[PDB]
Design a protein around this ligand. Structure first.
Ligand SMILES: NS(=O)(=O)c1nnc(NC(=O)C2CCCCC2)s1
Ligand SMILES: [Zn+2]
Length: 222
C-alpha cells in the first residue's frame, strides 16, 4: 500500500490508507516529538558494542538504509542487550529539540531477545562534510534498489564518545506506526555538508520526516 510524505498519501492521511495503518492516526504515544519540557533523571549508561561488518545499502523508496544481515553490533542499556538490525536517515530531522529541526537524523533500530524495539537517534547539524558517512553516500542507490558493499563498514564511527540521551517511549515514525518502541535520543550532535543532504533527498525523492506528534501523557527524561 503506497505511502509517502507529500501529495495524497502524506502522514496526515496514513491512518485511512488501510485498516492496519490505523495507529498512525489513533495512537497516543506516537513518534517523533518536539522535546521541550523534560524531567532531569539518572538514566542508565549506554554501552556500545559496534564493530565493522558486511552491510548492504538500500533505497527502499522512503529512506536510505544500511542493513545488517548478522548480529554482532549490539547495545547494552540497563542490563538488556539490543541488536542492531539496520540504520537509516531522515532529511530533515523528524524529532526536534525546543522547536529546532536539524538538517538530518539517523536511526539505529535494535531488537532485544524478546523483540522489544529500541531506536537510537543521532542528530546532525550543518557543518563540514561527514567523512565517516562518505562510504555510504558513494554507493547510495538513487532509485529503489540494493547494493552490497565490498568494504566492511564500522557504525562505531557514527556514534559519539559522549552518550548522554533523552529517553521517552514512542512508536515507529512509519506505517504501521507501531508503538512500544524505546527512544534514546543522543545530545552530542554530528555534522553534515549541505551537498550530502541534497544528494540524500535526490535519492529518496522528498523530505522524509513525519511531523511531530503530541507527547500527550509522556515525560521525556534527560
Ligand atoms: N522511522 S523509524 O521509526 O526509526 C523506523 N525504524 N524501523 C522501522 N521498521 C523496521 O526497522 C523493521 C525492519 C527491521 C527491524 C524492525 C522492523 S520504522
Ligand atoms: Zn526512522
Amino acid at each position: 500500500t503506497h505511502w509517502g510524505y507529500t501529495g495524497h498519501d502524506s502522514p496526515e492521511s496514513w491512518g485511512n490508507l488501510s485498516e492496519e495503518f490505523r495507529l498512525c492516526s489513533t495512537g497516543k504515544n506516537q513518534s517523533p516529538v518536539n522535546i521541550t519540557e523534560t524531567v532531569s533523571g539518572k538514566l542508565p549508561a549506554i554501552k556500545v558494542n559496534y564493530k565493522p561488518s558486511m552491510v548492504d545499502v538500500e533505497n527502499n523508496g522512503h529512506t536510505i538504509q544500511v542493513n545488517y544481515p548478522e548480529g554482532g553490533n549490539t547495545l547494552t542499556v540497563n542490563g538488556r542487550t539490543y541488536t542492531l538490525k539496520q540504520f537509516h536517515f531522515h532529511v530533515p530531522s523528524e524529532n526536534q529539540i525546543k522547536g529546532r529541526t536539524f538538517p538530518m537524523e539517523a536511526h539505529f533500530v535494535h531488537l532485544d531477545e524478546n523483540k522489544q524495539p529500541l531506536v537510537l537517534a543521532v542528530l546532525y547539524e550543518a557543518g563540514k562534510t561527514n567523512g565517516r558517512l562518505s562510504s555510504i553516500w558513494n554507493v547510495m542507490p538513487m532509485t529503489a534498489g540494493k547494493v552490497k558493499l565490498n568494504q566492511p563498514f564500522d557504525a562505531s564511527t557514527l556514534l559519539p564518545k559522549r552518550l548522554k540521551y533523552y529517553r521517552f517511549a514512542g512508536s515507529l515514525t512509519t506505517p504501521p506506526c507501531t508503538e512500544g518502541v524505546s527512544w534514546l535520543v543522543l545530545k552530542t550532535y554530528d555534522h553534515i555538508d549541505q551537498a550530502q543532504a541534497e544528494k540524500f533527498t535526490r535519492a529518496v525523492g522528498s523530505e522524509n520526516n513525519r511531523p511531530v506528534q503530541p507527547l500527550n501523557a509522556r515525560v521525556v527524561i534527560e
